[PDB]
Amino acid sequence: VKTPITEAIAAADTQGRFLGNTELQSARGRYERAAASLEAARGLTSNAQRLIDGATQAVYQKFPYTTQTPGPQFAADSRGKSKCARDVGHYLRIITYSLVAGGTGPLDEYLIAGLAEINSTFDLSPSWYVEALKHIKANHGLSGQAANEANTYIDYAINALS
Amino acid sequence: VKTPITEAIAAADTQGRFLGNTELQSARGRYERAAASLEAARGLTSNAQRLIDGATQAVYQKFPYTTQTPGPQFAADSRGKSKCARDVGHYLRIITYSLVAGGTGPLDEYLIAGLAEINSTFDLSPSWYVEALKHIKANHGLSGQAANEANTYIDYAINALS
Amino acid sequence: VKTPITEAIAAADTQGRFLGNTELQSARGRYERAAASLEAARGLTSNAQRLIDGATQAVYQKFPYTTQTPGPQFAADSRGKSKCARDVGHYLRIITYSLVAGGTGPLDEYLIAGLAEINSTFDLSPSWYVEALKHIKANHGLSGQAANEANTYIDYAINALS
Amino acid sequence: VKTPITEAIAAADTQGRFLGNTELQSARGRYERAAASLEAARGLTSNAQRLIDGATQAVYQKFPYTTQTPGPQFAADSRGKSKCARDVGHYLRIITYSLVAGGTGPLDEYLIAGLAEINSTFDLSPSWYVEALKHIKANHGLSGQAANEANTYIDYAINALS
Amino acid sequence: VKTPITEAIAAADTQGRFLGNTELQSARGRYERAAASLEAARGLTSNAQRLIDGATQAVYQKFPYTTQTPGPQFAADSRGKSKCARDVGHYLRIITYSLVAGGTGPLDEYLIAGLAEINSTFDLSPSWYVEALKHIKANHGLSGQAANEANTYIDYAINALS
Amino acid sequence: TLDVFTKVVSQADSRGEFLSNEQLDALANVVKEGNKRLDVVNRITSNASAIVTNAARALFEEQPQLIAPGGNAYTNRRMAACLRDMEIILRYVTYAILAGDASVLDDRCLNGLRETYQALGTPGSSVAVGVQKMKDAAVGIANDPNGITKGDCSQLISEVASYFDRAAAAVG
Amino acid sequence: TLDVFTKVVSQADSRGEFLSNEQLDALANVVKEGNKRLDVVNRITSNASAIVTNAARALFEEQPQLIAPGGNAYTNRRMAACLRDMEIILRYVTYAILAGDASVLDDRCLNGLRETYQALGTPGSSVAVGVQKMKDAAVGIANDPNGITKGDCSQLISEVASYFDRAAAAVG
Amino acid sequence: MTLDVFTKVVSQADSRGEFLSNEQLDALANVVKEGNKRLDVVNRITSNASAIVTNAARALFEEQPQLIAPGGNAYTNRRMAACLRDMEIILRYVTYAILAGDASVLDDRCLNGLRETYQALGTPGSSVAVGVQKMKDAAVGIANDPNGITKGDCSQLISEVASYFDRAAAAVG
Amino acid sequence: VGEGDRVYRLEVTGIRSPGYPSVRRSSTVFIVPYERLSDKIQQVHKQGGKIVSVTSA
Amino acid sequence: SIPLLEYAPSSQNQRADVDAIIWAGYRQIFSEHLIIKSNRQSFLESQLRNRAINVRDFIRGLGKSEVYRTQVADLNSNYRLVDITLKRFLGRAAYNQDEEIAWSIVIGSQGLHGFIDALLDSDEYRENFGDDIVPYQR
Ligand SMILES: *[C@H](C)[C@H]1/C(=C/c2[nH]c(/C=C3N=C(/C=C4\NC(=O)C(CC)=C4C)C(C)=C\3CCC(=O)O)c(CCC(=O)O)c2C)NC(=O)[C@@H]1C
């Protein structure tokens, strides 16, 4: 799965050669970046419960019909709202997973793989989840270069949504 | 493109043999349903203008927020409603096209090919168009076996939507 | 094996899609003709023993040397005449098989597959068997559209012979 | 085309290597026999006109119906007998061609390639031509090792016929 | 493995046909060549011990540093000189093997396959072994056509060295 | 790939006799009931996508650890994996009703299914709880008469449900 | 691959309008004239191998140097080469009568055939002397008044012969 | 399948479906901190990669000398080049394992079907793992030795560098 | 080998690869239909040859 | 659509002229007996002589040929077919049993025709044989 340490391996393995100094450079880059990436993981893990209920009530604001229309798909009764905090709470897990991995791999393999297939069948509009993630990237309270770090992977999930 | 007369050809062409009685059986069979299929084409062409504005105001009923939310994608102002009757009016064209062709070919090549790519980018939820097509299949006023005929291709566009 | 119901399946299976109305339409055509094809099966099964000995003594007329020349291949010996009614009697079986199947499949798989390989090795000239089948298609006594039905598959075995 | 000098080349060319002593040895073998093979070419070229009309009247003996039955395929009138000495006279050409080439190549490329396709369409039974070639291999009057050499290629055309 | 009798087989096997006269001719050539090739085998087997120590002391002449420089690869002490007569004595074995086989096969499979891989790793310069083989081809004392016979395979090992 | 028309040929070839008249009277009933067979088939494929998610509202709600963290339907590719081949059951059951004999279904759909389902680690028995939930929705649609001439297709309904029971037996 | 049904769609898509009622009355005659196409088509394919050798003898008897030593139909694989694709004319003309439009004919026999026939050195004009001899035998079989019932196949016969004339124009 | 130290502590954390704990991030913070040493270890192995293989072949064949003597499976020349074409593939994937930091990329290539071919071919399987140990004796001698480099304890890397060779010898023998 | 007749001729200039065994002749046309033309242009550019002309057929 | 599941690869040891080439292509795929008289296609033979269709393109027709489908695709199981498919074009039996199984589900969705197209598309297959070279054992 996609990781800068893995991407050095799978490039050098398909050539059948050893690890050159070029394969090594990708690994070297991760340590300096990875020091600021683990700063972004603790910023999201400590503020996790504020961010989930901060998000799942922000999507109810811009889409008020989602709490009103009676359907299995919509979040009309409590069972949808129970599956609301599950789904949005699944996003902050994988975002924090792809932070400490350094790559988009866990985001590529757990979340966005086959997302167009599932949202068409269950009629979950992807405009809902992109509205929650814009709330997360503006309200995580992170600062410095770590604020850039979470901001890529959130925005990478945004582009894969649309 | 997919047609029962074409499907007899492309099957016999890849085999490098002539037209057997098994390819030639379909043509005889096709005419009997094609006699009732052209009945369904005149039923939709004559009632075309009633069915389009019957549909594009039925989708506004179940989704009242689509006329209220200000977005390029939504049908808030008149430009969306101008593109409303274009898009739903495009559907009744291709449904009438696949009626007289006998196959799903024109439906497969003009309408549903790459529909998951376009609805993700422009954020057009496919739950909108399936609500218009349920209005068409219940309000075309067609009867007999021709009422079955339009009802397959409408429902074939429904399954490709979701 | 080749059948209009099978040909609808193998076309739709290689595309990975469901059964459209174009595969389904093909099946409908087969039924109209299958009602007249089973008429042709009873016409050949009831007149089976008249048609075999009607044929194997008609080929002896046009080829009188086949009963005179001493050879393993030749039918001059009784053992050849025993293998005469076996071989020509094998043809009316497969012709009646391809009648009720509706396709040329059983004719394609049991009879004509690899027929050029076998007739070269055993020196059986294919001009013999085509002379018997012309006797069958003129003396089956079948009438109407069923007379057309047996006449295709007999003539399909003729073209595969030469 | 197939020749022991050619077969040394196409073997060494597909390996991308030079001519080893193993390709060289094969060439020498062809040359040594080739001294007795050109003996067989003059034995057939000088007795050519005796052998053709010796053959085309021997096939009329064993198959007397071929001069009696009215059909283009058959040699009933003079036009078939004109095409009789053409066809059997074509065989002694290619047999003499494959003698001086040392291989079966000219026999493989001019005569027997696609012979099962042509004899099925024009209904020329291959039992006719094998009866002429048995007359040639017994009446060429060749002796010694050249008699052995001439026979292989005649008998090679016999097996390709049946 | 590569032999003129084998090369007739593997050519005719990949075509799926029998042994023609062209495949056969290569085998015929070997017997005349093979009568003079076995003359060359006894000329090298009887003079084997003179030729090995004639060679391994000729390479010490042109390369006097090979007995002086202390390295594992170099033949400085007795261990290298023990592995000297092993390696050069391995060459006269395979040369005598490829003599009686008629082809370069045993030379191709035992000696020169992967020789560029081994001489790079152990730093054995191939200019050493080509100097010993020039001593063998000039001092075997063979005469006539058999003197040509050993002279090809020795020179074939020379070109594969460089 | 076999049929009703071709399988009564294939055993008749193995015994080497001409087709009897009561086999042709049997096939004449197969042609006679052919129109009814076609109608049932078109209703399944037109409601094909509506069946699968409505089975997935119960396949996962009844065994809720499967999509909970740890289950084999947990992550999103894994979830789309049991919708990419929940429909392949419907893709080949509809081929079986079209052919009229389950020999097409056996060769591809269930021949190697029970072997992969212990190689992957997926619960094999947790498939056949929901293929039964497909059959409860498939014969509910195929029997209901909407805009259709009155007719009796009861025989098809029982041996339509026999194809689902064969589809559940070789997985569980 | 186009049709009569699909080509009147394809120009109707390019103008972007609904299909008119007189186009549907045109296609209603195509369905009505549809049965005749099948009858004509089955007689050609059942006499398909009988046409080629009968067409072929004239093809070689009229220009007799072609099989005489030197001509491009001389040797035996060369002779089997102009029977391996004399029938491919019939393989695609019968596809054209089935589809009812020559747009499937012009991609296979008419597209690059005149280019190979120059490079190859085989005479190109000596093909279209015998494709006309096929048309003289094809419309003789298709129009024979034997069996079935009397009907007007004249329209089909003239535009069956138009497909052979298109098949001869792009080779000569 | 290709896993890491960073990705394997994700993959079990996905299977339990919880957020990553703080003591797992303090564990990975030591991996980044100990990360620089890992790069250096790989660099010295790959720069002396060709020097290890023949120096192992100066003992792999000298200790079991029938192998290159006539009859052994390392006898002829292509054969001899066959056990240098894949003596280095052990080093090609052990260096991938130290780079990734976890042996999950090692067990798909050298450990997966290698013990099956080594009885299908006829080669002695146990005569490989006598010399892969001789590689490990030379690999940790080069990696351990410091010339013109700052000195820090490399025991964690070295002990578990030698664990990758011991896994490479266990699935062949 | 394309479901429909939509074939475009392609002319590459100079193909670099293992030049004796893999690409024995450069500057040759490849006749690929419409369906794989997306795939084919990525295949040519991986070797490094440049397209001259693309002619339909 | 969805990316293939990662499968472990088992170690492997492996890891007139115009007329002959046509036979070679036929031979690997049909194992000699299958070509018969009926299986052979006139159009494919013409294209090679003609050279309009590439060899890589030539094989796809044989793989997707109707005769081939009846003989191997129909009778054999999907899992067996994936393994069966590998020997003729790739020339190598699959190293991992799990990998073979993964291929089978994909084969069913796209059909027999779909699977064959995919093999040509894969980078390993094209590189190993090349368009010009007929498929050979590895
Ligand atoms: C470990 C088994 C042995 C060892 C290692 C060791 N390394 C360092 C320090 C550095 N190593 C590197 C290496 C790299 N930096 C890069 O960017 C790259 C490319 C990917 C490499 C190869 C560097 C640069 C440092 C520090 C910075 C510098 O050298 O300029 C130390 C000491 C310093 C530290 O802790 O980082 C040690 C000990 N030393 C041994 O004795 C072991 C056998």
Ligand SMILES: CCC1=C(C)/C(=C/C2=NC(=C\c3[nH]c(/C=C4\NC(=O)[C@H](C)[C@H]4CC)c(C)c3CCC(=O)O)/C(CCC(=O)O)=C2C)NC1=O
């Ligand atoms: C591990 C990563 C992962 C995620 C995130 C995931 C989401 C996911 N959410 C689903 C349904 C759902 N998702 C929601 C969530 C929402 N709907 C709303 O109304 C709100 C706008 C929104 C929450 C903010 C609801 C209410 C359902 C149930 C809908 C239904 O049953 O039709 C479904 C289909 C049915 C299911 O098993 O429960 C999936 C697969 N699956 C995954 O594997």
Ligand SMILES: CCC1=C(C)/C(=C/C2=NC(=C\c3[nH]c(/C=C4\NC(=O)[C@H](C)[C@H]4CC)c(C)c3CCC(=O)O)/C(CCC(=O)O)=C2C)NC1=O
């Ligand atoms: C020939 C068959 C055919 C159809 C039907 C089709 C539809 C189609 N509608 C589109 C956009 C659109 N579609 C709509 C229609 C709607 N949105 C709403 O709010 C309403 C609910 C609904 C109408 C009832 C609107 C308003 C846009 C513009 C959205 C945007 O620009 O983001 C787009 C993307 C942009 C475009 O080119 O205009 C396509 C491709 N394209 C096709 O080729």
Ligand SMILES: CCC1=C(C)/C(=C/C2=NC(=C\c3[nH]c(/C=C4\NC(=O)[C@H](C)[C@H]4CC)c(C)c3CCC(=O)O)/C(CCC(=O)O)=C2C)NC1=O
């Ligand atoms: C199920 C469909 C089927 C048929 C029909 C069939 C025919 C068939 N007939 C054969 C031989 C034969 N066929 C015949 C028949 C005839 N020869 C004559 O002289 C008469 C003109 C003519 C009969 C009217 C004879 C006499 C033999 C034996 C010839 C020999 O042994 O060389 C052979 C080769 C040897 C054999 O197994 O017996 C086959 C394969 N095989 C099949 O699988």
Ligand SMILES: CCC1=C(C)/C(=C/C2=NC(=C\c3[nH]c(/C=C4\NC(=O)[C@H](C)[C@H]4CC)c(C)c3CCC(=O)O)/C(CCC(=O)O)=C2C)NC1=O
């Ligand atoms: C260079 C190698 C070569 C040969 C040998 C060859 C033979 C050959 N003989 C033919 C016809 C013929 N072959 C014969 C020969 C015979 N028929 C009989 O009745 C006798 C038994 C037998 C002679 C002993 C006859 C009479 C025809 C004319 C038949 C017809 O026109 O239908 C034909 C088809 C029409 C033609 O162009 O004349 C070919 C291709 N072609 C070749 O390229």
Ligand SMILES: CCC1=C(C)/C(=C/C2=NC(=C\c3[nH]c(/C=C4\NC(=O)[C@H](C)[C@H]4CC)c(C)c3CCC(=O)O)/C(CCC(=O)O)=C2C)NC1=O
């Ligand atoms: C059957 C055909 C065959 C040959 C000929 C062969 C040679 C061969 N000689 C070798 C080493 C050697 N080769 C030599 C020979 C020489 N070095 C010198 O200094 C002298 C100049 C020269 C002899 C005249 C020596 C001394 C070694 C040992 C070098 C070392 O251990 O590094 C090696 C590598 C180690 C080994 O297994 O002993 C091979 C494979 N192998 C084969 O399979």
Ligand SMILES: CCC1=C(C)/C(=C/C2=NC(=C\c3[nH]c(/C=C4\NC(=O)[C@H](C)[C@H]4CC)c(C)c3CCC(=O)O)/C(CCC(=O)O)=C2C)NC1=O
């Ligand atoms: C044409 C007939 C046919 C079927 C039905 C079939 C199924 C099949 N499903 C598979 C995996 C799978 N099957 C499922 C399905 C499920 N797992 C769950 O968690 C749910 C309980 C259940 C669905 C209700 C999933 C999620 C995978 C992926 C598992 C993995 O990748 O390890 C695999 C192995 C990998 C693959 O290629 O995708 C096969 C062969 N193959 C066939 O050829």
Ligand SMILES: CCC1=C(C)/C(=C/C2=NC(=C\c3[nH]c(/C=C4\NC(=O)[C@H](C)[C@H]4CC)c(C)c3CCC(=O)O)/C(CCC(=O)O)=C2C)NC1=O
């Ligand atoms: C392939 C395209 C195609 C379809 C779909 C098709 C269906 C079809 N179903 C028919 C009849 C029918 N279909 C049904 C079916 C049923 N009635 C019930 O109450 C049951 C629940 C159900 C079966 C489960 C019945 C009862 C009839 C009555 C007429 C008959 O026996 O055919 C007929 C008779 C002719 C007509 O309706 O004009 C048609 C056309 N024909 C076609 O050409």
Ligand SMILES: CCC1=C(C)/C(=C/C2=NC(=C\c3[nH]c(/C=C4\NC(=O)[C@H](C)[C@H]4CC)c(C)c3CCC(=O)O)/C(CCC(=O)O)=C2C)NC1=O
């Ligand atoms: C007038 C008597 C006569 C005929 C009939 C004739 C045909 C003929 N067609 C040829 C070639 C050919 N013919 C075709 C034709 C086709 N291939 C396909 O796949 C397409 C479907 C089809 C066109 C629609 C092809 C592809 C060739 C390849 C060689 C060439 O370019 O000529 C050749 C080249 C020489 C040879 O085959 O020996 C001959 C002889 N030559 C003659 O003298």
Ligand SMILES: CCC1=C(C)/C(=C/C2=NC(=C\c3[nH]c(/C=C4\NC(=O)[C@H](C)[C@H]4CC)c(C)c3CCC(=O)O)/C(CCC(=O)O)=C2C)NC1=O
């Ligand atoms: C000589 C000029 C001439 C022609 C050509 C002719 C054909 C012809 N074919 C007819 C019927 C027909 N023709 C077919 C033929 C077939 N259906 C299939 O599905 C099969 C594949 C194929 C046979 C292989 C059928 C099924 C009918 C139905 C009516 C009948 O039984 O005659 C009829 C009935 C009357 C009519 O159609 O108006 C005509 C006229 N009549 C003429 O006077």
Ligand SMILES: CCC1=C(C)/C(=C/C2=NC(=C\c3[nH]c(/C=C4\NC(=O)[C@H](C)[C@H]4CC)c(C)c3CCC(=O)O)/C(CCC(=O)O)=C2C)NC1=O
């Ligand atoms: C048997 C028919 C045949 C030949 C001849 C052939 C030659 C051939 N030489 C090539 C390259 C090359 N050929 C040369 C040759 C030379 N450059 C100079 O300056 C020298 C004067 C000269 C050698 C004396 C070079 C330098 C290249 C590499 C060009 C490059 O990399 O751009 C290539 C492509 C690049 C490659 O794969 O290496 C081919 C196809 N291929 C064939 O199939």
Ligand SMILES: CCC1=C(C)/C(=C/C2=NC(=C\c3[nH]c(/C=C4\NC(=O)[C@H](C)[C@H]4CC)c(C)c3CCC(=O)O)/C(CCC(=O)O)=C2C)NC1=O
């Ligand atoms: C990436 C994982 C992997 C491995 C390891 C692998 C091994 C492998 N080793 C082989 C042969 C061989 N391997 C050896 C190896 C040895 N001889 C000895 O004495 C030593 C003990 C030992 C090496 C240390 C020999 C001599 C052969 C040739 C045997 C023969 O041809 O008879 C072969 C057959 C020829 C070839 O190289 O293609 C394979 C495929 N393939 C793989 O994919």
